[PDB]
């Protein structure tokens, strides 16, 4: 039950800065060494950052050095990447890794730092109304990546696909969350799908009835 | 500079695969501190081996690591569906820093066949009050990972307001895709019909909606 919680990243403009989080638990943060790993889409994996368990010793990779730091929190359990003057080079999903001895168990599930020039767009929600029947939710036009769609608050996971976002002519993304459900839950059972696009903290939560 | 890697690799169903990992003699050649790692689409990296040859509780013994010169090897027995995924190689290198493997794609061939389910929606009300106009096509559980999607109004052709996405693998190990075409209100209204064609292997299934 090791476990790394990893938060912020989002859009930033070319230039600019964001500071990455990794949150630890389940083990001693100390007595192990941290990475950071980041995977542009859709490449491969690269090493970009390596802290010791007391943050004396920091290594980066030359690709980043002069514009991302490394650090580490003893006493709050975090891990840290702090980076400045971002490209569009850097748009990546950001991984932080637990070391155990030159190898790497357990990483974060990571996090997306998109760096480009384009404005960010919450998606409009709407409803796709219908043994076993289909209903989803589309989500239209929004940027950047990532949405979350979740169904009566968590409460429905059985059934559910979630679809990758199609990347419009436009620029901008939509996906569409479809759940099959018991067709005699229809007209008792309400559902609701939840969205989540947090690079514009949109919300939305749309029922979907027959 | 990188640790170089096969960019795919391909075998059948029961059969053994070998990764090769070559480097330098400033890391494999020189350290036991290589690791493999396996990573799914859309999921973060998983470790398999380290040290290697050594296994992590929990990696199967299919999995296993070896080492000569400056190039490591990943073998991959009795080659599963759950196989098919990325597979990295990691070093220490000299200047107590890490280096990653470009990367292999592990395809395993002799699957089953799969007809793609299709799920087709018309534009919701919303949507038309909106001024806007969308059908979704969902398509799932097909293999092997490619598909054809055509769009019908009545029973012509649309080759404008469409967008397709490629080919993902699920979490049943199938493929889904979708397809979304872009209409304005009065189009959806003015045709009697509109279908979408999914065509795959050489089966074609085909999805209808009408304004209802």
């Known amino acids: 039950e090791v476990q790394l919680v990893e938060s912020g990243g989002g859009l930033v403009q070319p230039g600019g800065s964001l500071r990455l989080s990794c949150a630890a638990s389940?083990?001693?943060?100390?007595?192990?060494?941290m990475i950071w790993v980041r995977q542009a889409p859709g490449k491969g994996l690269e090493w970009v950052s390596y802290?010791?368990?007391?943050?004396?010793?920091?290594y980066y990779a030359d690709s980043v050095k002069g514009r991302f730091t490394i650090s580490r929190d003893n006493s709050q359990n975090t891990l840290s990447l702090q980076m400045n003057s971002l490209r569009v080079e850097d748009t990546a999903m950001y991984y932080c890794?637990?070391?155990?001895?030159?190898?790497?168990?357990?990483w974060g599930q990571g996090v997306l730092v998109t760096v480009s020039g384009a404005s960010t767009k919450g998606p409009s929600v709407f409803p796709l109304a219908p043994g076993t029947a289909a209903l989803g939710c589309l989500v239209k036009d929004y940027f950047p990546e990532p949405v979350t769609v979740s169904w009566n608050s968590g409460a429905l996971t059985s059934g559910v696909h979630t679809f990758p976002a199609v990347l419009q002519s436009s620029g901008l993304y939509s996906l569409s969350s479809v759940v099959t459900v018991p067709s005699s839950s229809l007209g008792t059972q309400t559902y609701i799908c939840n969205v989540n696009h947090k690079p514009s903290n949109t919300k939305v939560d749309k029922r979907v009835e027959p | 500079s990188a640790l170089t890697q096969p960019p795919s690799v391909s075998k059948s169903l029961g059969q053994s695969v070998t990764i090769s990992c070559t480097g330098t003699?400033?890391?494999?050649?020189?350290?036991?501190?290589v690791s493999w790692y396996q990573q799914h689409s859309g999921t973060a990296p998983r470790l398999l081996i380290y040290?290697?040859?050594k296994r992590p509780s929990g990696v199967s013994d299919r999995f296993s690591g070896s080492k000569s010169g400056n190039t490591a090897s990943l073998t991959i027995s009795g080659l599963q569906t759950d196989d098919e995924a990325d597979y990295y190689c990691?070093?220490?290198?000299?200047?107590?820093?890490?280096?990653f493997g470009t990367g292999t794609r592990v395809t395993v061939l002799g699957q089953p066949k799969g007809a793609p389910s299709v799920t087709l929606f018309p534009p919701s009300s919303e949507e038309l009050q909106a001024n806007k106009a969308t059908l979704v096509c969902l398509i799932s559980d097909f293999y092997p990972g490619a598909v054809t999607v055509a769009w019908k109004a009545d029973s012509s052709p649309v080759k404008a307001g469409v967008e397709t996405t490629t080919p993902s693998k699920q979490s049943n190990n199938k493929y889904a895709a979708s397809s979304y075409l872009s209409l304005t209100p009065e189009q959806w209204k003015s045709h009697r019909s509109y279908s979408c064609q999914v065509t795959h292997e050489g089966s074609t299934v085909e999805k209808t909606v009408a304004p209802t």
């Open positions: 890794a637990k070391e155990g001895w030159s190898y790497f168990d357990f």
């Open positions: 389940g083990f001693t943060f100390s007595n192990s060494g």
């Open positions: 802290i010791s368990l007391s943050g004396a010793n920091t």
């Open positions: 003699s400033s890391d494999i050649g020189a350290y036991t501190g």
């Open positions: 040290d290697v040859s």
């Open positions: 990691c070093s220490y290198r000299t200047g107590a820093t890490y280096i």
